[PDB]
Amino acid sequence: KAMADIGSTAVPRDVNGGTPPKSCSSGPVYCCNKTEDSKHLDKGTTALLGLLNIKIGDLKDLVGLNCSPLSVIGVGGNSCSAQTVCCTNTYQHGLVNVGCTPINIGL
């Protein structure tokens, strides 16, 4: 039972030291003014993506325009007053963002 084995237990969501504000271990969370459907971006957003050579058809969930990277939790990271999502990568300091999923920080 999780002392000489990892088969009897199955709690991947339970973490040792679960800090109140949930975040992604895949990287910092992002606070985007609006996450845009990467399936069908606006031509204006598609434009930026084209500038950066991003593949729209390769895109997954959402993108994020003018997004703020939340890497330092607390002052700054937990100071997101906009929409908070979990993105896989970031471009243009936040002007365009990729692989964004709506994260429930819990607070």
Q: Percentages helix, strand, coil for the chain, rounded to the nearest 5?
A: 15, 25, 60
Local structure of 97: helix, strand or coil: strand
93 touches 54 (CB < 8 A): no
Alpha carbon of residue 62 to chain centroid: 9
Contact predicate 64/96, CB 8 Å = yes
Distances (CA, A) of 101 to 3, 4, 24: 34, 36, 10
Question: Tokens at residue 22, please?
Answer: 């949930």
Backbone angles phi, psi at 13, to 5 degrees: -90, -20
Q: Is the dihedral of CA 49, 50, 52, 53 positive or negative?
A: positive
Classify burial at 38, counting beta carbons within 10 Å of its beta carbon; exposed 0-12, middle 13-18, buried 19 or more: buried
